[PDB]
Design a protein around this ligand. Sequence first.
Ligand SMILES: CC(=O)SCCNC(=O)CCNC(=O)[C@H](O)C(C)(C)COP(=O)(O)OP(=O)(O)OC[C@H]1O[C@@H](n2cnc3c(N)ncnc32)[C@H](O)[C@@H]1OP(=O)(O)O
Ligand SMILES: CC(=O)SCCNC(=O)CCNC(=O)[C@H](O)C(C)(C)COP(=O)(O)OP(=O)(O)OC[C@H]1O[C@@H](n2cnc3c(N)ncnc32)[C@H](O)[C@@H]1OP(=O)(O)O
Ligand SMILES: [Zn+2]
Ligand SMILES: [Zn+2]
Lengths: 311, 311
Amino acid sequence: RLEILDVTLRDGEQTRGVSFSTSEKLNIAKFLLQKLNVDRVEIASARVSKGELETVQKIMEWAATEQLTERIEILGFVDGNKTVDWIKDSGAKVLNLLTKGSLHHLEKQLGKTPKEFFTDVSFVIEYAIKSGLKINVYLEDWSNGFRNSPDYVKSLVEHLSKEHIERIFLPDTLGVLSPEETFQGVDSLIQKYPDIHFEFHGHNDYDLSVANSLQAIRAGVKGLHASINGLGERAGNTPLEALVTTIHDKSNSKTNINEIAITEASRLVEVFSGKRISANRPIVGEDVFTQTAGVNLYANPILPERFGRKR
Amino acid sequence: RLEILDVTLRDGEQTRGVSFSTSEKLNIAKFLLQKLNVDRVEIASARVSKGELETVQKIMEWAATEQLTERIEILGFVDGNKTVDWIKDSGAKVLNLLTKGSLHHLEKQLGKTPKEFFTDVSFVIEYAIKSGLKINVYLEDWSNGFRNSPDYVKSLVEHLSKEHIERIFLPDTLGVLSPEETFQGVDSLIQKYPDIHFEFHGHNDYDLSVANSLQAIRAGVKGLHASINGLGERAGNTPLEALVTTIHDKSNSKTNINEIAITEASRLVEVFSGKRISANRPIVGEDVFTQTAGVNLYANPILPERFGRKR
Ligand SMILES: CC(=O)SCCNC(=O)CCNC(=O)[C@H](O)C(C)(C)COP(=O)(O)OP(=O)(O)OC[C@H]1O[C@@H](n2cnc3c(N)ncnc32)[C@H](O)[C@@H]1OP(=O)(O)O
Ligand SMILES: CC(=O)SCCNC(=O)CCNC(=O)[C@H](O)C(C)(C)COP(=O)(O)OP(=O)(O)OC[C@H]1O[C@@H](n2cnc3c(N)ncnc32)[C@H](O)[C@@H]1OP(=O)(O)O
Ligand SMILES: [Zn+2]
Ligand SMILES: [Zn+2]
């Protein structure tokens, strides 16, 4: 009853020193969709470069072969026709539009009016639909936007509700929210728009992302974003492995993820990305199942074979 | 207004492949108390072995030299006179007694009665006081105990309240609590015993320890336990660096920790302990301040120089 969007290949790629080859991205994409069973994957950003375009084409060639094309998503921008054209040629059929979720960002980067910007947005969604694509919209910096420019944010959502988009994404872009705050901002929107599919997208700057994610689930979110090993730009995104385990054991909601493929997904991403995880990394670290001082008295609901390890 | 107990040298030492030399423990102890300014440090477990006894003696020799002896604490057990004798010779003046916080543990390990066990407990506290020591009591497995054997737990606390101990520790020994749960169990006790100093001690098995810790602060806790780099047996203890930053920015409570010594405390522990931290480790990872894709628009309250880095 909860969709899971993995942004490991995109948001996770932005990380310093990390860059996946076409072979690695295809390998990871196949695993997450077929083995780990994550609902969808965000494999790239449009207009990044050629090669990245080729990469998306191969994955779409494959994804088509497997009736999964609708499960791949591309991060795009409000640039008129450039993003949609790029995604059009890539082979991908889904665009996750990046819009300004804070009045502060809109003015300091674009220097536009909520009216002007909404027109630019409507064009892109308009042109995207016209081009056979589906659209999800990111309210970038929403975490700061609903706390400082709550009006701009309400009109932006008000505008997107009159548009034909699949989902609206509420990201803690700078990862500055506490769980109480995440609940407020999300509850605020879900209660005004009970018919829109919202998904929370947290970042782990204060090591609160999965806790925040839980509160978002309380507020009424229908999906969550996460990356393997919490790969991402700063402290990374919400760590997929701990989020799912936490959703399964500490919430009445469910997920379609196969807990058993969790250890391999991690090893895969760790090797290919080249970013080592600590031995104590929750659920997925090397020594996380080892209790040397504990002298089934100290049995934890977190067992090695539950995640495809030690058996 | 919130005490911080660092268990990096003890609970953190239990970790697989980790063992600090007398020189390293002294170095870390001095830094945490003098530089990082953590209220107290738990440097060892009594009766572990000789050498560890020597180590505590040197630190006490030093701590005395600096009028800090009352800030060092030793993990002890309910063994009659053995623990108190050991701590007596060590030089340490504070004992953190390990008691059974769950009826399940008491019976499956000791096979004793709440009455019998309380008598053994009262002896140790009795004999400890008689020996010039101060006492804090750990309700081991409390996280499972207040959810399954809430009665045993209420009498245990009821008994400890009639004793002359400094504080009572509420540990999520197996790290299985959600923030909502942590609030319930802690609020439950604080409301029955408004005059006792309770401290939460979380573990990061679900990557919820600092979120749990925040709720404990809500419930009315007066202190928190944590380890540098979240060092600890399984997923480790609550990560000190993220806890403090989170307490400072996301709660109305305060701490006496010097945020500036945070990066060095981490490097110190990482090297000496030999457990590498990931580059994305919140607040304290190598690339945690780097945003390569972010194109002061993306200014986070988490700056490098705030923690003694990049300047
Ligand atoms: C949640 C918790 O922290 S559970 C804590 C359990 N144990 C500890 O904290 C002690 C940690 N031990 C050490 O650091 C040891 O020096 C090591 C591990 C480095 C090397 O020796 P080990 O034998 O591996 O240590 P071990 O794992 O046995 O430590 C457990 C200690 O708990 C002691 N213990 C636990 N309950 C009792 C009790 N009721 N009465 C007496 N001793 C007890 C055990 O006796 C042992 O100490 P001792 O056998 O030397 O007297
Ligand atoms: C919260 C966020 O995720 S902010 C996202 C910002 N940027 C991205 O997501 C794109 C990531 N870029 C890449 O992966 C690149 O291929 C790299 C970094 C690997 C190598 O090239 P770089 O130049 O370093 O990428 P860069 O950091 O510039 O990426 C930013 C992109 O946002 C694009 N962009 C942002 N806003 C707009 C806009 N309003 N109109 C057009 N393009 C925009 C920039 O143009 C750039 O893409 P482009 O210059 O190729 O058209
Ligand atoms: Zn993001
Ligand atoms: Zn512990």
